Amino acid sequence: EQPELEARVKEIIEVDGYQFRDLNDNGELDPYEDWRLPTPERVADLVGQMSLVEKSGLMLINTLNAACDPQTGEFGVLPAQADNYINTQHMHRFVFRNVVDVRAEGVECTGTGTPVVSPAEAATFTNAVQEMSEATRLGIPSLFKSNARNHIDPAGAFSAFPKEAGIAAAALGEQARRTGEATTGDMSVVADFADVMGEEWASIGLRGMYGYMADLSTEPRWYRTHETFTEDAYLAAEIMETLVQTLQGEELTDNGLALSPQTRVALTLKHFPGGGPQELGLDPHYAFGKAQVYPAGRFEEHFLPFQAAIDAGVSSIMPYYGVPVDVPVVGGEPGETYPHTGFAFSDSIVNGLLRDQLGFTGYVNSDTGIINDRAWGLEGNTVPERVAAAINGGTDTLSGFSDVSVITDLYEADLISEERIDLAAERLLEPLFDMGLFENPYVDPDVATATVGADDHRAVGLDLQRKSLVLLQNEETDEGPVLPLKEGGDVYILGDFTEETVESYGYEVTNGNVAEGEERPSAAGSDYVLISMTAKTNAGDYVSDDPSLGLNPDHGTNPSVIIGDDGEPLPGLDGQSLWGAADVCVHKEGHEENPSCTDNRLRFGGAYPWESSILDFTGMEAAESWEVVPSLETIQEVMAEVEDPSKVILHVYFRQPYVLDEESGLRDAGAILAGFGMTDTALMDVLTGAYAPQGKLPFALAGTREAIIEQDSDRPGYDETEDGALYPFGYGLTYED
Numbered sequence: 001e002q003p004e005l006e007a008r009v010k011e012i013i014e015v016d017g018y019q020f021r022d023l024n025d026n027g028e029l030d031p032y033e034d035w036r037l038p039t040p041e042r043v044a045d046l047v048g049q050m051s052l053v054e055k056s057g058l059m060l061i062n063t064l065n066a067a068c069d070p071q072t073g074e075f076g077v078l079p080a081q082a083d084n085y086i087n088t089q090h091m092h093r094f095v096f097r098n099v100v101d102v103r104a105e106g107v108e109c110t111g112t113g114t115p116v117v118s119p120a121e122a123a124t125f126t127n128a129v130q131e132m133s134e135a136t137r138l139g140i141p142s143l144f145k146s147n148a149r150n151h152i153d154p155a156g157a158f159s160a161f162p163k164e165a166g167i168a169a170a171a172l173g174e175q176a177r178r179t180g181e182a183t184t185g186d187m188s189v190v191a192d193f194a195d196v197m198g199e200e201w202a203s204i205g206l207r208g209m210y211g212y213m214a215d216l217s218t219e220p221r222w223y224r225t226h227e228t229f230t231e232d233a234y235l236a237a238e239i240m241e242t243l244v245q246t247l248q249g250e251e252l253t254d255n256g257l258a259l260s261p262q263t264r265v266a267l268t269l270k271h272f273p274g275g276g277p278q279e280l281g282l283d284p285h286y287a288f289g290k291a292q293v294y295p296a297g298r299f300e301e302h303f304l305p306f307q308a309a310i311d312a313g314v315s316s317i318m319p320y321y322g323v324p325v326d327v328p329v330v331g332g333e334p335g336e337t338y339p340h341t342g343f344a345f346s347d348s349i350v351n352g353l354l355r356d357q358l359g360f361t362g363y364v365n366s367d368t369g370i371i372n373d374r375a376w377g378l379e380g381n382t383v384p385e386r387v388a389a390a391i392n393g394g395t396d397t398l399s400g401f402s403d404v405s406v407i408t409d410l411y412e413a414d415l416i417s418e419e420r421i422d423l424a425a426e427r428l429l430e431p432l433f434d435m436g437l438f439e440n441p442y443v444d445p446d447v448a449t450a451t452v453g454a455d456d457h458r459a460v461g462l463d464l465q466r467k468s469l470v471l472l473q474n475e476e477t478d479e480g481p482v483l484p485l486k487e488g489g490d491v492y493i494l495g496d497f498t499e500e501t502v503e504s505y506g507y508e509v510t511n512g513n514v515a516e517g518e519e520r521p522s523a524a525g526s527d528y529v530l531i532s533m534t535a536k537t538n539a540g541d542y543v544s545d546d547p548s549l550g551l552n553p554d555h556g557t558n559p560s561v562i563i564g565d566d567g568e569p570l571p572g573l574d575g576q577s578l579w580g581a582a583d584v585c586v587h588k589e590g591h592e593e594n595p596s597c598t599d600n601r602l603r604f605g606g607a608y609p610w611e612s613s614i615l616d617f618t619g620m621e622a623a624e625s626w627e628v629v630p631s632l633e634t635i636q637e638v639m640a641e642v643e644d645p646s647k648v649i650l651h652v653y654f655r656q657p658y659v660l661d662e663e664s665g666l667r668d669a670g671a672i673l674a675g676f677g678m679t680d681t682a683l684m685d686v687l688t689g690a691y692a693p694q695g696k697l698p699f700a701l702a703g704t705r706e707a708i709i710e711q712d713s714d715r716p717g718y719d720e721t722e723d724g725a726l727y728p729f730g731y732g733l734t735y736e737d
């Protein structure tokens, strides 16, 4: 019956033999403090006593990182803006972005940066914010969200798993190992991962997530394919279902939300209705990439994973920045299309599709910076006008917006009704009640130390690392298949292999990784060449209003067209404009005089927009804003030096679905693997045969740039291209001894 309580500011009262937190400090048991009552009655009572500004503060969510004190040496103290956000803006939702890890030897507090914090220091920080929250007039608790933390970057003290697509590759591979088929996957793999994450996140007082991503990698030119699970909507739907059930629980409320005190992490699924199908792969963080296009008419396949998570009870939904171009309204009158504005401003999307058509009963969380930076389709509108349009469109909380006074001002100007603010307040407050946070919002920092990165948790991650690896090619030689490796030999390594780790398996290693000013030993005479390679963007020089770049006629024109709902094309988006002409620094269609460029330095990722279709390794080596690592030139020298290329093992990190073009010579390697993030001993354990590979690709790979240029950005695979796929979805070899 009686749930545990903890209070550091307010007092505990007991009534009818039960104890309660007196959060308004009146000395009596209000219904919102009365945990015996159903949540709607607790919310109604709480919303009844809030001032307008306290209600409007709930509609903001902003970065609140732990800081360090240069004079005490303590890490995990409150930042400067904590007092403002909690006490002046009345916020109770925050994004925690610090790396959680143990700092080296010698690290002292200094610099503008975001300090690294241990698990115990992270818990101390979030407790302190909860302490400051309880100290407010009604002592409403706070909720921290974060992006993903448990993935190897090819994190910190959290237990390390492969990237999202590696988890899907492992799930498909274990289905095929049990059934013979690779369709929707073995979801015990996903549940095992989610179980470790939920336990570790909750132990530091991190009870929400910006994620996971249900977006589909149907457009290989989209730089965010690196954080998608799959291109296939039905596998994605099965994964989102399992993530909600495991992270939120299977216990549903009467509203149909999987929210209980058993909820370890409440998910804010992103990015609705699906960020995958970007025109030319250009991303809507950037002005030139506002458009999402659906040439194969698959808009409904893309919100199918969201559908599945909504039914499993997911807490929260984040719309993407994108603009849906000419999309028929689901369940609407004939000839109706969705507005050509960003998703969070469209009542048709957030209230119509998400709530009315799909039945979502939770709250809606904007993506970060839609108001000031990415108010797509609202370029001429003011900031207050943009706030009202997102809130009235169905968006309940604004990520990256700080200023509660703008919402109160919009109320006094009758641009947002108080009935709408009450509705947002209800949706935002209910999960905090249902998750037990009004009763006890604190955590034990020392239990975090014993939980984050536990040995058994790390073991689960290691298993999935080994099961994510996909064997794509393993050529038969006179002495048998290239893989697994034989015992002993001379091994040449290139790329991110640790020499002593490879030596430890009983090989003599020659390291081709030399600095730019030293000569590289030849690979001649090696029994094996281990190359670990990938490609990266190097687009930090991009400037939208620079005639050398964004305004350079030699870079061509942006083919993307978006006709505004007023009848005029969006700036720089008429299909004839220079790439940089869509940036507000160029068009200046707002209220405000020389606006900064939003696209400068492409700081979120992605190549130069004129280079977004160069996904082949040969093209990428020559491209201005792509880089092959190690260089394709060095790789090609090395493969010639060994003379017999079947002695070369390529381990490739397909950050995007890169194209192994025949001109590049990479297909002459004896073995090719796709890796999604592993320790060196996990990969050496598979290469040397202690374990056999079993992963299967959760997206198809193409063989030509033409297939890249021809495929439909909203359709999976390459079956409609002339050249087709090099490797299809669900493909992957093993050792057959």
Ligand SMILES: O=C(O)[C@H]1O[C@@H](O)[C@H](O)[C@@H](O)[C@@H]1O
Pocket (backbone or CB within 6 Å): 095, 147, 210, 211, 270, 285, 367, 368, 399
């Ligand atoms: O972390 C954030 O605030 C968000 O940043 C935005 O740029 C991304 O679109 C979203 O996926 C992140 O969750």
Ligand SMILES: [Zn+2]
Pocket (backbone or CB within 6 Å): 025
């Ligand atoms: Zn007191």
Ligand SMILES: [Zn+2]
Pocket (backbone or CB within 6 Å): 015, 016
């Ligand atoms: Zn009573």
Ligand SMILES: [Zn+2]
Pocket (backbone or CB within 6 Å): 022, 023, 024, 025, 026, 027, 028, 029, 030, 033
């Ligand atoms: Zn009270």
Ligand SMILES: [Zn+2]
Pocket (backbone or CB within 6 Å): 053, 087, 088, 090
């Ligand atoms: Zn105030």
Ligand SMILES: [Zn+2]
Pocket (backbone or CB within 6 Å): 054, 057, 090, 091, 092, 136, 140
């Ligand atoms: Zn408040």
Ligand SMILES: [Zn+2]
Pocket (backbone or CB within 6 Å): 226, 655
């Ligand atoms: Zn990445």
Ligand SMILES: [Zn+2]
Pocket (backbone or CB within 6 Å): 238, 241
């Ligand atoms: Zn199911």
Ligand SMILES: [Zn+2]
Pocket (backbone or CB within 6 Å): 278, 279, 281, 282, 283, 284, 289, 290, 291, 292, 322
């Ligand atoms: Zn786009």
Ligand SMILES: [Zn+2]
Pocket (backbone or CB within 6 Å): 414
């Ligand atoms: Zn009035």
Ligand SMILES: [Zn+2]
Pocket (backbone or CB within 6 Å): 444, 445, 446, 447
């Ligand atoms: Zn303790």
Ligand SMILES: [Zn+2]
Pocket (backbone or CB within 6 Å): 199, 451, 454, 456, 457
């Ligand atoms: Zn454990």
Ligand SMILES: [Zn+2]
Pocket (backbone or CB within 6 Å): 480, 481
């Ligand atoms: Zn054989």
Ligand SMILES: [Zn+2]
Pocket (backbone or CB within 6 Å): 508, 509
């Ligand atoms: Zn030696």
Ligand SMILES: [Zn+2]
Pocket (backbone or CB within 6 Å): 553, 554
């Ligand atoms: Zn020219």
Ligand SMILES: [Zn+2]
Pocket (backbone or CB within 6 Å): 555, 624
């Ligand atoms: Zn150029």
